[PDB]
Ligand binder design. Sequence first.
Ligand SMILES: *c1nc(S(=O)(=O)c2ccccc2Cl)c(N2CCN(C)C(=O)[C@H]2C)s1
Ligand SMILES: *c1nc(S(=O)(=O)c2ccccc2Cl)c(N2CCN(C)C(=O)[C@H]2C)s1
Lengths: 161, 174
Amino acid sequence: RTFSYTLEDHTKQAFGIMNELRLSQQLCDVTLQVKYQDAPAAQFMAHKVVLASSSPVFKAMFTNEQGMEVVSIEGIHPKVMERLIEFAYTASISMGEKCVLHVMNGAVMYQIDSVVRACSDFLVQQLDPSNAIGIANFAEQIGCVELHQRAREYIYMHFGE
Amino acid sequence: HHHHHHSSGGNRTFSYTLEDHTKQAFGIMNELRLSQQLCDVTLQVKYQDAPAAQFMAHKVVLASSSPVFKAMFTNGLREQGMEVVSIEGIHPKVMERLIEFAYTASISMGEKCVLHVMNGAVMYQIDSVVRACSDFLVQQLDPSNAIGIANFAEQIGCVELHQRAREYIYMHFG
Ligand SMILES: *c1nc(S(=O)(=O)c2ccccc2Cl)c(N2CCN(C)C(=O)[C@H]2C)s1
Ligand SMILES: *c1nc(S(=O)(=O)c2ccccc2Cl)c(N2CCN(C)C(=O)[C@H]2C)s1
């Protein structure tokens, strides 16, 4: 008859090693160059296949061919991209409250929907009269319909509307 | 160096983990393997009286599941195209099962295949498969097979299987 084995946390151990390889700059076939405003240029080595596995945008980019590619990024802060890359390689992201808007914007641009959803839910929790308008505005700018609606609903509710 | 161009328009802590992210990601990495997309390695596998086989894969995924593949591919030249690696002394179906494990975390095979796979797993230091195979054979330990299994363990280099088998024999005599 049949011998069948599953290692539950194999994908975690494997991502651990893929992250080690990233930081050692081993087997990296993509370089992300990030330029923001009047800030120093930042460079991030990574593996196309790991990026494609976490982002439909990277998947579309790289499946549409063998050799180092450079992706030049403008108007995104290096620490935003570093946080998204670390998410792709670890499944985790941790940051100050003031970072959430810039990261959610990053996440949207590379369709890391789970991070968009995490950021969105967080801001809906933090809604108050001071921030409601800014958040609503931001939501409209970056195109997050659900965050915009929750924020607009929270504002017009203060006027029995 | 094919270039891409992307342009853009209190004190509480935010932290998020997507529990099954590595599973979803491996799902897509496996999809990409079977569609032969983003693959940078082709394994050519040749063994005894069996037909030549090709397996396309991603060096980084193989290296993440096998220290031998990791050593192989970090010792190879950088900015290489597709690389073709000749492999000998492992049967294509053994390597196919190990690759599928690397990409899915699961392995299934006939009971009679366990020895050839465990041998494969040891050769490429896929230790969790070695451990799985070993524990299975330890379940089969009896007076008839204890010696054969102990011998096998020594042949293929599996320390844990050899010790568990020798420990089972020493229980009768010491
Ligand atoms: C959390 N992240 C940052 S950041 O990554 O340093 C950053 C800098 C500039 C633009 C966007 C981001 Cl996410 C934070 N900040 C760093 C300090 N600072 C001057 C900020 O304005 C603030 C956003 S919060
Ligand atoms: C389970 N798998 C196989 S196999 O994949 O067909 C194979 C062929 C040749 C060498 C190694 C393997 Cl794993 C089995 N076999 C090994 C025993 N045997 C006598 C076979 O011919 C073959 C079916 S068992």
